[PDB]
Amino acid sequence: KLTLYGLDPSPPVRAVKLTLAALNLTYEYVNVDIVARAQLSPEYLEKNPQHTVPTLEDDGHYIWDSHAIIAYLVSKYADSDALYPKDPLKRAVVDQRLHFESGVVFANGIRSISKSVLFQGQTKVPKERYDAIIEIYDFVETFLKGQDYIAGNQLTIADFSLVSSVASLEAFVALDTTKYPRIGAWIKKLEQLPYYEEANGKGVRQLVAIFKKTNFTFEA
Amino acid sequence: VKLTLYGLDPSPPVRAVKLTLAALNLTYEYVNVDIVARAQLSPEYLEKNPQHTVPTLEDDGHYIWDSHAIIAYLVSKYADSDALYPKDPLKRAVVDQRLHFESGVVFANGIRSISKSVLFQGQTKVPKERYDAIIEIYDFVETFLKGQDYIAGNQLTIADFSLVSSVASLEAFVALDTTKYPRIGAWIKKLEQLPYYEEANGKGVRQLVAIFKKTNFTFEA
Ligand SMILES: N[C@@H](CCC(=O)N[C@@H](CS)C(=O)NCC(=O)O)C(=O)O
Ligand SMILES: N[C@@H](CCC(=O)N[C@@H](CS)C(=O)NCC(=O)O)C(=O)O
């Protein structure tokens, strides 16, 4: 019995939706209205004291942080270790990419802007935040050099994690696929998964539209 | 020997790896990478780590980077038991949440946000936002320690090494009020009892604090 707490525009929530779909697991999806600060309710804080989404409930146990969740799901429920290989050297690449996503991409790239634009209602965003997004594209383009997937030669949860956030960066800076052909090819490859549209595609488009509506701009 | 660690003592994620190597009693070569001299940007270093960060670990022709990936690798490959990184999916999920909390909320948003501005871009005035972020980190860690002696449960794990390397470093920006944060104070004190703590984490924390003291940076009101 799985319950996922979150909302479709959220990148880390979509990373979990991709993993759940890839593992063909059934779950209840509970909406959490972040703009209304519904995550700050006493009832949600009891589930996740960091008051973030996603939170996964698995038969009474609460797990949070999307990367911890999707590793947990694969380790516990997958038929094989395909999505999260147990071989320590292969796992070390996956883990590096996941922690890259946690810090460099999401915390420094996305939440840094979401906080000032959506949470604080500010229209102007410091130029450093633009520079941070270009740095992310540059790194991811390098990470994809000579391989079809982000962490090696097979689909893993690192792909789910990073595609959920890297595709979201379009909300701030459109991806130039002439400058970034590897990133373009990799998103296109992942878009072919039958569950991609419902798990990640539509939420990306929603987030992009949310930020379009704010009319935010980068400071020079 | 077979293991090489690339890094430098003031760096919190390098110290996370030094703590783990010490706890596992592994021998290794320590190679200094002077990030102040931008030595991590040499083409030679980029071949080992294209993200040009420290730490990097070299193990028999393989390069691993990101401190959290490195220390999970070390325990899984070399430890006698999974004590420091339990394999039980549920216990593992708590450790993993704490590690990723360190990557994003603590290091990226808390420390590197200020370090880049102050150490490498020479800014002396830091926005109040960055002070508030450190206080929120202290608030979260205090909550995480509720009812237990360690950060991810009832036993020492790599989550303790990761988070103490960075949380102890926060003194460089905001001194820790142990009357407001008695659990954090006790937890740091408990880890300081580890005989390998002084060399692995303690010296470098003090170095980092002294580096920031010298810059004379302040937070805006
Ligand atoms: N790295 C974390 C990010 C979690 C996170 O910050 N989620 C955002 C939504 S995208 C959130 O919960 N914001 C509300 C809050 O922190 O109060 C993860 O992968 O779960
Ligand atoms: N979260 C990463 C942080 C790595 C990191 O950013 N290290 C800093 C030093 S504390 C660095 O290498 N700065 C040089 C650079 O990024 O070029 C980890 O745990 O390894």
TrEMBL record, chain B:
GO terms for biological process: glutathione metabolic process. The keyword Lyase does not apply. InterPro entries: Glutathione-S-Trfase_C-like (IPR010987), Glutathione-S-Trfase_C_sf (IPR036282), Glutathione_S-Trfase (IPR040079), Glutathione_S-Trfase_N (IPR004045), GST_C (IPR004046), Thioredoxin-like_sf (IPR036249). Its EC number is 1.11.1.9, 2.5.1.18. The keyword Cytoplasm does not apply. GO terms for cellular component: cytoplasm. Glutathione binds at residues 11, 40, 52, 54, 67, 112. Residues 88-217 form the GST C-terminal domain. Homodimer. This is Glutathione S transferase E6. It comes from Drosophila melanogaster. The lineage of its organism: Eukaryota, Metazoa, Ecdysozoa, Arthropoda, Hexapoda.
